[model samples]
Target chain A: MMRIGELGKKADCLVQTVRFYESEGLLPEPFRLYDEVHLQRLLFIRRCRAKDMTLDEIRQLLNLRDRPELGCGEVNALVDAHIAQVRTKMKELRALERELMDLRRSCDSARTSRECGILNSLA
Target chain B: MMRIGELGKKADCLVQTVRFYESEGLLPEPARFRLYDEVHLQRLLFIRRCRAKDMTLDEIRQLLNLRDRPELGCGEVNALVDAHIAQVRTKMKELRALERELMDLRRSCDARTSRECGILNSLA
Candidate 1:
């Protein structure tokens, strides 16, 4: 068992994050050696969150820790949802790239502010 | 008075957006000729929203529309807050651009999955 600070080092996560997970019902509250149990729990959370999982998805995945009898299908569904969200983000980035290129090509700062497409966009 | 569709056209916003604004307390409910007053209310909402104000900021700004006699400080504070938000977003975009370039450069898929830094980053 270690101190909270040591647990943070072990999990490579912030103390606040451990507390937050506990508050969110994602991490089981431990008695006596709370810090050690926190480190153990966060070992799983840090790995999952590093993959950019949202809080809601993280909550869903954490439920698996409670019901170990459940199959991997729950985990696969969460991963599929994350991949779909990622693809959607990729599509938005692509569209943003196109818009940025168009903005760069279409307007001159030397033009009147009234005539500036960028200003129109910003406004 | 025009219909909901015409109200949306007049305000240059979607009908659902007008409904959303109304539901969110940003717009007052109009009786009888709801669509006509909707168009009028939406003119205000559309201009505010087009400036990329968040729903909470819109709520604050809408409160000002109710109290016409209140000081302009409320309005100015919202603008300042929005400017701060915009600056924060600009910084994030700057960081995102750098991260994207680094991600683009730091990859060689020819390597085994175990050896690929790109895989490590994708896991990022």
Candidate 2:
């Protein structure tokens, strides 16, 4: 068992982050010497965040996790949903790249700002 | 000359956006009672299109000044576009790798008891 600050060092995150997670309700309130559960929860939270899970998504996972007797189907479903969302974001970025390239390609051989196709196309 | 609503209508952008640019000093303030002119119309449209391409206000201001000169040079314009393109491509590449991490983590779990859950077990 370790205090909140010590627990943070063990987790390799700041005490502020630990307290913030507590405030966000992603973590339960803490203690003078935190329990194994607290350390494990903190580690799990940092791992989830490392994978870019939103607090809301992490909340859902936390709930599923505490129900240790339940099926893990929900866990798979949540990960699948996150995977699908990432793909959607990726697609939007690809389209934005094409748009940027099209605008960029406008300036083939610029003679002047006034003559620059990119500058002219922008306005 | 027209007021903000009419000016925004011409530019096909929000009236608030026109006010924001004015607040940003990108556009000159209209005369009291908000009378805007042809120059305001053109400047606002120029800003609107640059913003559409995701140029930062800082970048837009630089380009706007360059456009104002119209004679100094065009070299900087190409450089700005090239840098912005590189920035966009880097983020795209980053997102590409992010997708792989997620796929591997999800694949690590083959659907089992929560206690034995590979996802949960891996987290530990």
The candidate that achieves the highest TM-score relative to the unseen native structure: 2
Residue pairs with backbone atoms closer than 3 Å in model 1 (clashes) = none
Name the TM-score of chain A in model 2: 0.85
Q: Any runs in candidate 2 off by more than 4 Å, and if so which? A: A31-35, A108-110, B111-113
RMSD score of candidate 1 (Å)? 8.7
Q: Report the CA-based lDDT of candidate 1 relative to the real structure.
A: 0.53
Fnat of candidates, each listed: 0.00, 0.77
Against the native complex, each candidate's DockQ, computed on alpha carbons, is 0.06, 0.63
Pairs of residues clashing in candidate 2: none
lDDT of 2 by residue, B1-124 (tens): 8888998998888998888897887886675556988989999878888887888999998898888887777888888888998998898888778889888888888847787788877876
Per-model CA lDDT versus the true structure? 0.53, 0.84
Q: Could you tell me which 10 consecutive residues in candidate 1 chain A have the lowest summed lDDT?
A: A114-123
TM-score of each: 0.51, 0.85
Please state the error at residue B2 of candidate 1 in Å: 15
Q: Top model by lDDT, which number?
A: 2
